[PDB]
Design a protein around this ligand. Sequence first.
Ligand SMILES: Nc1ncnc2c1ncn2[C@@H]1O[C@H](COP(=O)(O)OP(=O)(O)OP(=O)(O)O)[C@@H](O)[C@H]1O
Ligand SMILES: [Mn+2]
Ligand SMILES: [Mn+2]
Ligand SMILES: [Zn+2]
Ligand SMILES: [Zn+2]
Lengths: 64, 114, 263, 133, 148, 83, 188, 146, 36, 764
Amino acid sequence: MIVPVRCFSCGKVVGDKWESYLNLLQEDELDEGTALSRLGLKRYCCRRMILTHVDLIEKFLRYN
Amino acid sequence: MNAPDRFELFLLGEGESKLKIDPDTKAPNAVVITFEKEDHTLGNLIRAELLNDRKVLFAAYKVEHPFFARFKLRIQTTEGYDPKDALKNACNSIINKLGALKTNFETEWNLQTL
Amino acid sequence: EEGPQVKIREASKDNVDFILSNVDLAMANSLRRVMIAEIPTLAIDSVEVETNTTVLADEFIAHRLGLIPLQSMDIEQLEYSRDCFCEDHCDKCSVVLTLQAFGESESTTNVYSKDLVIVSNLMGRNIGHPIIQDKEGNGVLICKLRKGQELKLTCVAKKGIAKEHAKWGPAAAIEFEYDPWNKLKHTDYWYEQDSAKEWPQSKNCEYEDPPNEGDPFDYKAQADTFYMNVESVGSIPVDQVVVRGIDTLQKKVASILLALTQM
Amino acid sequence: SNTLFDDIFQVSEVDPGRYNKVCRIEAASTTQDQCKLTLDINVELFPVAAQDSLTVTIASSLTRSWRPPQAGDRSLADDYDYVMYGTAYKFEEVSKDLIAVYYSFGGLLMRLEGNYRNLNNLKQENAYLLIRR
Amino acid sequence: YDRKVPSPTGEYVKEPEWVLETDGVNLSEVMTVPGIDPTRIYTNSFIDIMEVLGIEAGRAALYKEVYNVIASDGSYVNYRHMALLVDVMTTQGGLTSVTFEETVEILFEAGASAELDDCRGVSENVILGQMAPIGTGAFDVMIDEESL
Amino acid sequence: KAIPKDQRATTPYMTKYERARILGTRALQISMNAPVFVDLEGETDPLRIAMKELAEKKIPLVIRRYLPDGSFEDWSVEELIVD
Amino acid sequence: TTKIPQIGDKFASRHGQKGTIGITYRREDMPFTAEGIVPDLIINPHAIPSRMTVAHLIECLLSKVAALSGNEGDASPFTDITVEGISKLLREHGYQSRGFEVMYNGHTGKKLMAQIFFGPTYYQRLRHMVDDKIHARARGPGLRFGEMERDCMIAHGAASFLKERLMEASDAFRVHICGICGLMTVIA
Amino acid sequence: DVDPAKRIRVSHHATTFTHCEIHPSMILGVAASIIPFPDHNQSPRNTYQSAMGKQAMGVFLTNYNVRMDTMANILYYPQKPLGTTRAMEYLKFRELPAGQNAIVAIACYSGYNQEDSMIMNQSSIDRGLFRSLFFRSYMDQEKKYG
Amino acid sequence: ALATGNWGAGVSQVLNRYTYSSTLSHLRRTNTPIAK
Amino acid sequence: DFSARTVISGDPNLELDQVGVPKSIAKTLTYPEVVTPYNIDRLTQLVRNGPNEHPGAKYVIRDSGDRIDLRYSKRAGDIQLQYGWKVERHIMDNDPVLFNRQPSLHKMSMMAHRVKVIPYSTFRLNLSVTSPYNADFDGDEMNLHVPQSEETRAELSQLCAVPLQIVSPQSNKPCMGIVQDTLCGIRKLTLRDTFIELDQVLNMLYWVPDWDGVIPTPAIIKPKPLWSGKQILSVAIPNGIHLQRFDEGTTLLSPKDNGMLIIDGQIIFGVVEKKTVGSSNGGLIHVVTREKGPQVCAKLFGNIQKVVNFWLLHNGFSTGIGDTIADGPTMREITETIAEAKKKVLDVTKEAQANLLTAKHGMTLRESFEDNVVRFLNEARDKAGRLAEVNLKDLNNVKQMVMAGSKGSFINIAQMSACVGQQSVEGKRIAFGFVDRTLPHFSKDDYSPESKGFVENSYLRGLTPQEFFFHAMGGREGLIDTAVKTAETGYIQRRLVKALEDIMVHYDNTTRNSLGNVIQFIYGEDGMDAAHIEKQSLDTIGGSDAAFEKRYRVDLLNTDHTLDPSLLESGSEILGDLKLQVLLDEEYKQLVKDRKFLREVFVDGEANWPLPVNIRRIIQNAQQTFHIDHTKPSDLTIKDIVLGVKDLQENLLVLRGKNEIIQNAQRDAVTLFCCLLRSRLATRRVLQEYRLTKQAFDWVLSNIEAQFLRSVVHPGEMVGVLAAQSIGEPATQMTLKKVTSGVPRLKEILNVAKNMKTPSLTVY
Ligand SMILES: Nc1ncnc2c1ncn2[C@@H]1O[C@H](COP(=O)(O)OP(=O)(O)OP(=O)(O)O)[C@@H](O)[C@H]1O
Ligand SMILES: [Mn+2]
Ligand SMILES: [Mn+2]
Ligand SMILES: [Zn+2]
Ligand SMILES: [Zn+2]
């Protein structure tokens, strides 16, 4: 619904990287993989976390 | 639910001990100790040292079911040599080589930048 | 200093790559495990919810609060709540943190873990503080509000071990390798046409001599040298994941000598 | 307490077929027209090549636990490179008016054809096997 | 087809033979055709076997139809289970197929026929509060006054 | 309608069903504080006790076997061979 | 309620094979890659060759590349996506190219003789779980014993059981009975 | 000179075409449009997936908090599949997914995953893997025809 | 008739909402009452 | 009532006969246990714990019939039990309970297990009980039933308990074996090259719970102490167990490590796979059951599992996409394989197109054409798949499963890696459901492979759209056929059981209905229990006349054809003795008749037939047990043998009546077993082959006789139900030529249908 706090599998914090990841794509124009590796998410387990997040809360916030 | 609390993996119920030591019937100068609220971390380590001891005739451990944090270690030794003595000898070495290693490390880390 | 030998090759606030040298696989593996499972650490483990008009449910939020890593350098000097003589919690067994947020702005207001206020007496032990490692010093995103929405909470942290719930774990991944060439033949490589074309060379191979095709297999060799790399989440600095890691084992094994003595 | 056959062999052939650590020597006796060895060996612990040659002794000691080296730090009823320990399962292939005794070393197998040690080769297990290069 | 037959020296050998196989069945009449072996003619219609060759030959056809079915899938069941079945099907002398308050209908008939219920079934025994004379119930147990 | 002790034609071996029923009738009795005939060389478990009983041949019971035609033979526990 | 996964809950890939969780292991105890990656889930090889679900295996290869490279991996049917191509790309990225990795046993740290096909695959949590599914009716004041269960008990010969189970608790009434006219006419 | 790893196709022996397919993957329905590589599966299995998908938990609508239905399952942390189909775009499966990308090993390891069973990572669970919300609504009417 | 399925009956059913694509699927179902 | 139902899971750490029951379920179900001085203390404690702490209790009932409710009861902490009260206690470790997976189609779907109380919420089971219950761990649930009295507990443990159902009557072999992992791995463990080192050895050894504590001696001493995989498994196979088996050219030096040979409980040669340790006619679990009994056999499946899954946990095993890729060169050969078959097809086509093809005899031209193209295309699929099999290596993990026996077969290799092949709907190639075509992407009158459903591609490679759709047509037909099978089968099964349910064996050995009618004058025509019957070869039947006379003829009056004097002590002294010769002529005449008789019974010459008392394995035991030297003459005499074997025949009793009729029955019942007997213990075999001593010989006999007597069926068995369930239950795994077959046939049989679908006469 919202970035998860850590990689389910390794524990790395990943919940402090979502705003940046998204800034890194739309503001500095990197392809998703280059952007991930810039946030230091280099094992495929963490990469999967950000790359396949879906921020549903952004929809949930539209209701009154 | 029917899930046993997680604390049960490291913390002794009422009435339980760290060790129970029992004589083994099968062969001489043998013992079986059951360790509670422990698992492989200890169990493979005590074990593997017991085997660096040449008065150690047998050593082996197992966790009989993965649901319970308990292991069972069987030491057999040469005539005259108490197995509980072989397990002080072996827990002793352990502590000593680690001793060692936290020092070799605390060192190597001020030799260090970043 | 004779015995098990160390050899850091990199270090960083966050990771420490090293090489253990002159030790058994078991003690190596054991230290790996301890670092993963049994180093004490501090983590939200109770959450009272005064108000949540958020779009997330409470246990969803709670769960997320248990996961925010909290400073833990001085955690030996916090007693486990279950050893303390207080009724429930207090300042010897617990930090208490507050969280209030209100979606004041029109646009969407984020709640981050810097918005966590400690509310209890620390006795100047360095614990409790939300850890912060992003450029903006937000740390972790906890929630999001809309204009009109509210969330007020208290939390209690408590000392704990990842065995009991991973939130309490300090370490994150732990690289661990040995014998990169395969000399020990501890593994047997799968392949279609050629084993060496088809498997990638470990970085750890440089550090070690390739074998020579003549050399008949060495039955006596053992596993003596290990390539590790411990990565910290941050509640505990790294060197300290190891040192407390070695130290926790050493206490495990001493509780075993103490209880032969009591037999 | 004894030893019980002992001779020197010529290696015809070394088949590994399908295995990696293990291979099947076909050897001859230098001496007898009659006495042969087909035998399975751990080639990683003890390599072996075509035409190499072998001093081979069955023996029968120097059934209680097994206890590590230590007795083994002086006490070697071996001056050899290579020692196995098996079990005879025999079939006394008593074929032609030559013998064949069979032997299994945790499943690494042997067979001796020949004749002169019929009143020699244990009916029985306790049987070691020993090789120098 | 190949047919295992003993050879002049005693051992079994293959000896092919032609065989005819038909769609449709006229056993009584085809049996009688010159040149065939009437002693080895077969059909998968066990009814016709029983009509021409009798109850026993039908029983043994029927088994062999049952056994074919079960082996054609490739499984194996011991003889005696299929033998039991096929006996149950043929013991009256022909081929018999095996395929608060209700029921009253049936009890009225019982009445009027003077039905004698042997009381060996498990339901009847339930209604009566008893064990059925099967397995562990097929004997009685009594106190051994004759012993020291 | 009864069949003299000689001339009895049924197996001299105990069947699995008789054995099961004996042991269990007897354990039912031992479980209701019925006197026991054998040395409890520790046992507390009534089935187990009963089986000790059956092995020492101290179960005084008789198996009445009906034949399909109404007629019956009586075989004692003592006498039945247990295999 | 929040439902946290448990022994007993059901899960599936998208290739028409489910399972239940038969136990959980904390991460220490799981096998690991030299990079210290550990599995979230471990499925048994015996579940594969008969069902011939090669698309599972291909999804896992493709999915490893996708994660490593940050692209969405094209799994549609009827294209020119190939394993060979997938495998190439994954080799470019440093892994052996059929998706095997060396792993190490958790309990010991020793390497594993065999290497292990390891990769992300998309799994679904399916509804309908050990808590909805467990009951246990033995009174105080399926799940039955029907025709077929009786028949098995007859087969084993268990008459006493069959009487106990199929009784009434409807008490045994007693009754006198003439031995000439079997009826319950007897004045007692 | 064709690619040894491509499938065999049997060429246009046709100069009379009147039409052409838009895309062959459009023969499939909604459910089977979510299976990756169905053309590499034995056919009954794609049939069994096409049922199970209907039991998976995801986010059925963005408005769940405001509905009140008999029963509902929302997964904490839906992830979109690393392996998708081009049909999914229309089915919005990336936006309202029903699944998570799990790191999976295929291995014999302890014997507790035999006979269509699985070992799952407890630590992974602790940190949220496959956790979901369940909601039950109960209703009741009042008085009636008395 | 909308509340029942009373028509030909199973003609009207409650819309599945387990998951987004189970919904779409239900809306796109067909049924045949009653030689291959 | 007194029962629970949940989800099942497997567990390698439970014994075959256990079931794990969650603690919550164990505090819900209860057993009424009577206070006595043997249990008043335990019952007391269980009362004080009460309903909600397990080992506890929910009610106490006194003298009165008064029911004391421990959860409410203001006196629940203060009960002083009396002898003769009752306590309803929670179930607890080792109570017997009955466990059942529905549908219960045969009796081993309801077996008694020993409780083990465990945490979490699933009922748990040993992997090897799975197959009788027909259960797996993807959802399946099963029901557990608690017996309520002492007699009922005895019935369940002394007749329905799992150990007693290892060997079943259905097929006179085991119905439980080693499966899945432990089967993949026992083979791996047992290869030539698998050696283990001391650290891992001792942990494997301590893993077997009743290892005597002796470390065995290593098969390698020399550069290094290394033990074999063989030896370590052997620790779990008990002493005095012998088994041998020859595979396609196994010898006693198995180049390939084929077959199997095991002596005194130690593996000598052979890799262990499904033929040895599976649920197989004459493998280890069938041997161990009989030689040492049910309880040890049931331990054995856990000691083998403990060992082997330990080893496999540290060895590892996996499978992956790689295991389905065959070589570039293999692929080209597969693709040509396939191209040639499409050219065969193309000629047969042109040939029918020119009107040159002939049908033969009531078979249409087009039927001929199709029969030929489908042979072609199947023959291609198959060659292509043999191709791929061959090319994969021993370390190919798909292959390693197939070789073990644990999962998968050739067709699976083939279709994954080489080619899926011709799809079919109702026995035929995909039909023209558009007018003269199978899909609109093709032109009309196209009978080619592709047009009619040949799928050339493998799964790895992927299907084309047209293939894809024809394979779904295919597939759908088996989904349908499957539901029709399951439903047809279930109705059959119930009707057979209702038909046969009252048939029982009686204490006259007769099998009868509830009327007392006779169905069979003796059960099974032989009076045996099918559980005690094994496939044995009847020796007299086969072979040439010369060969039978070398092996059995003893001619004491002929210096070439007597018993050499090294066979027997008396050997010198019997040469030319006339009156021994008279006995021996008599034994031969009976061997001769035997062979004639049997060749009339078995017209075919089939020598291997189920009979009770595995004589070869008794003799093999005698040989082990008396340490028998092949190198010394025996002290048996001619008369000892010849008359000893005649006397044993008289005591192989099935029927015991004093009249002539029952005697004839008895003799007829025991004829075939007596032929196998006289063939196996004939004089020259006893001396020249077996080399028995007098003492071993006398042991052989008295055992034959005890075992024979223990195979007889027991009166009271409900063989009806059994028959029916034995025939029905395997008619349920008919999930699957041009004669009506399989289930519809079998409907056609039991129904006695006037109007059968394919009636046929076979005329020789
Ligand atoms: N051990 C096995 N050996 C041979 N085939 C198997 C085996 N296990 C599963 N199958 C095959 O898998 C198919 C169905 O798979 P599935 O996983 O749905 O079985 P299942 O677990 O019994 O299904 P369910 O429990 O929902 O009834 C069957 O047609 C069967 O042939
Ligand atoms: Mn299944
Ligand atoms: Mn199932
Ligand atoms: Zn990660
Ligand atoms: Zn406190």
